[PDB]
Design goal:
Chain B: This is Mandelate racemase/muconate lactonizing enzyme-like protein. The structure is a homodimer. The first copy, chain A, has 13 helices and 14 strands. The longest helix of chain A has 21 residues. At the A-B interface, helix 1, helix 3, helix 4 and helix 9 of A face helix 1, helix 2, helix 3 and helix 8 of B. The structure holds magnesium ion (2 copies).
Amino acid sequence: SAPRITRVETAAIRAVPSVLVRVWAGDEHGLGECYPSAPAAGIHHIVMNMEEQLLGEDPRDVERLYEKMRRWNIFTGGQAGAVITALSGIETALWDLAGKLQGVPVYRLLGGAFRRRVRLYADCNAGTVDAAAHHIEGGLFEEGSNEEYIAVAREAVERGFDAIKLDVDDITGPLHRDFWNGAISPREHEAMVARVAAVREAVGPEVEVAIDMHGRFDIPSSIRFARAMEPFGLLWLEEPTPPENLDALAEVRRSTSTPICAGENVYTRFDFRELFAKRAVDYVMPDVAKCGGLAEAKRIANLAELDYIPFAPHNVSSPVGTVAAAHVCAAVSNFAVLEWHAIDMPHWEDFVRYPGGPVIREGHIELTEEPGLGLELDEEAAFEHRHEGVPFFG
Amino acid sequence: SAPRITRVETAAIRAVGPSVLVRVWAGDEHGLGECYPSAPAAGIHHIVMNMEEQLLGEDPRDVERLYEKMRRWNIFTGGQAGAVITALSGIETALWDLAGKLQGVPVYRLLGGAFRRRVRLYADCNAGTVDAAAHHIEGGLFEEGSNEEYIAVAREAVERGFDAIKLDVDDITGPLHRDFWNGAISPREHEAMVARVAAVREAVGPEVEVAIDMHGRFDIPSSIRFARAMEPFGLLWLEEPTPPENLDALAEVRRSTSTPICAGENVYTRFDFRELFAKRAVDYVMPDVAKCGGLAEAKRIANLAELDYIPFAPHNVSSPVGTVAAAHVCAAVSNFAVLEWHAIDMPHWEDFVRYPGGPVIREGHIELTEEPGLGLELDEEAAFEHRHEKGVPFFG
Ligand SMILES: [Mg+2]
Ligand SMILES: [Mg+2]
């Protein structure tokens, strides 16, 4: 029927505040989500600014369409982050649209499906953190902070999960001497270990538990703290050091038996190419809605596959972004677990209408056979949660 | 008195591209900075604005501490590089300016001092051909006799007082380029390029310095074959033969020829230039102060290169505001070589700022004053006359 790109519109929903991107091929459209990065207003204008390049194009050639917007930003931050996260949502939409247009589920456009049910892992939060992921409410030198954690974990296993994840950082805490260096104090140190030890005993073994450090610390601290984690048999220790020098991560990884994980803050495929080269990790966790979309993500997984490195994507978006990734995780032979950060957000599922009923069930996500992404945004619901600048389509 | 930050405003002008202007206030006082023309100026705008809740009340004198505040503030919000970095770059400049006005000392005297007082520039002789993605408009490289048009400008620059010229040689959208996706150079497309080079060299002479940009569009084979050909013309350097992602590739090319390899306009932050210098991929380095991270960042970057005896020649595509700040840094480092000027084609470039003596540039050089904070002033008038309709609201 020779379809063509007709219009591209955005919208900002409040979740974990992500931006939705809709791409129309006449009466048809695809839906995309953009990792909640920097200001939503920003992603917005970046995405809309990509419309010219899109208009009049054929949706079925998404990979080509990707390289197009990507190379068009070479001199305007196309290696960057925001510009790419903005591209992540568009690409998803295109994938959604292409699948529906040809009438096939996205994963069949990614090489088929190695599996049809994807397993997840749930995050467990303490108080209230800010944009920099710092605890405004709660912390190491707190009180029922640990119990608060153990509780969330319990509910997580209860709700059907067998993989949990929690952070152990607090830089704006009283237990931290200086904000600028990455040093951990003797006392600050053992306080962390205890937080870990506690949850480990509560959940007992046979329950995968990963720990996040939000890349705040220095070489010595990271190393010290990592050896400490060894007797706990963690699924992994996330970003011990700052995301900018991968050589440091490698040095840390190389220093202990505890497995290392990162990827959340590395963008293009070219960058993971370097991450892998430095043998910097045991597990890779890129974010589909943030790194460049499903296509980019599959590649990254393919690269890791050559080294027998497990693929466990980072995900902190609505049911949309989450399903986008589910599709990727299904066409990748070396997938491990997909992240879920919504144990604390009751309305999460109201953002979309999924076939079976809920998206998540028994700790997994059961992908269907419907055409492309197989979703349906509930517009009144989404509006009921719209972030309030980024216009809601109209 | 305890100056604290009080207000942060933006504004998008029309330089070589829509560029966000940043103004920071600490009471009656303010500092001025200019962002690099990245993506939609609106995005740069918002990013900058979203940054205000982090500055209010801060002592704008500990500038470096504030960059790290915002940079680190953006760990999980695209702060590793690109847009967010170009944005902060503007805000950084402002503060570095504000601070100088407060302490009452020119900026270079805050960056460790000056090695030289007047900085030499180089003229890009492809300024008006500008495509948002660096592609060449209405024809490109080959055509009737473009070589003529280029020699005209080359000479126009020498006359203008310059002794350093920059030229393009890529026409990916031209009739002589077989495919837009691979980066192969055809037999005839190749001769076309060398022709452009030869034509300009024979015209201007051997003492004028000429560098050539490839806008990083080619594969290993083409880059290498073209580089080996650039050897006889004694170029100043050859800019980005391969795409800006893989530096190992850029390094592989550099080991290939005797033609000097230069790069750096597409890499942000000290952390990334470290890897660059690590791979020994450049003969020259050229980050962009209004894009990479700020004067401070740019100085660190120069220092890293100094270690390896590598020349520092920043990429410049901004108005008098960004441009001058760039010279402050050019002054505070021993390995400075040449700063870029990309406005030979726009008559009102100077009408944006009121500069101490007469104009800013004078005979291919920029002389620096002892006037606190940069030493320049926004001709609010001209500024607004050339505002940008698309949408970032002016200073109010
Ligand atoms: Mg994380
Ligand atoms: Mg260039």
